[PDB]
Structures are given as C-alpha cells and as structure tokens.
Structure 1
Amino acid sequence: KRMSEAKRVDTGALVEAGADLDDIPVYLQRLQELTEEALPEKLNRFLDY
C-alpha cells in the first residue's frame, strides 16, 4: 500500500520500477538521495530572496 501511495505522488524516479517486496531497494535509495541534498529545508530562506 505504501509503495503504491509513493508512486502516486512521484515525478520521474519511481516511474521506472514497480511495487513489490523485491523492488524495495530503489525506494530507499531515492529517500537517501533526497536526504543528502537537504533540499526541502531551504524553503523559508528562499521565500525571502
């Protein structure tokens, strides 16, 4: 259920793999990547610029 919910909101990355107990590693890799960039946490300084 959770993988499908993630697929619903994805844009461009989960598009490739499916959703099964063998696909899992791709999801975690994407989460690690979107944690490295720390991107979602620039928001309230950029809304100033």
Structure 2
Amino acid sequence: LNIELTKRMSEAKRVDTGALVEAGADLDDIPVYLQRLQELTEEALPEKLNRFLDYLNRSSD
C-alpha cells in the first residue's frame, strides 16, 4: 500500500502547478493532498467552470 500511495502522490506532483508543490511525497504529506482534493471538488472546479461558461457566453456571442 505504501508503495502505491507514494506512486500515486508522485503522479499528483506530476500534474500540480503549485497547489501542493511545497508538499512532499511521504505519508505525512497525505492530509495536505486530501485537503487539496476536497477543495478541487468543492470550490475550485465549480466556480471555475462557472467562470469558463460565463466567458463563453458573454464573449463568443
């Protein structure tokens, strides 16, 4: 499990652009990632898709 977890964390840092850059790839850094995840599932994605659709409607039309 630990191996997998570490591997998974790596891929996260592979795609992150600064959200969890300061974080590491050890189990002690697991909560931070989790927190980030909930944010991406709570406020970032919803509001940001809202902004994208608002721009696509106000502009391009």
Identity %: 100
TM-score (ref. length: structure 1):
0.73
Q: Show structure 2 runs of 5+ residues with no match.
A: 1-6, 56-61
Runs of 4+ deviating beyond 4 Å: 40-49
RMSD: 2.5
Larger radius of gyration: 2
Q: Show structure 1 runs of 5+ residues with no match.
A: none
User: Which structure is higher in helix share?
Assistant: 2
TM-score (ref. length: structure 2):
0.61
Q: How many residues align?
A: 49
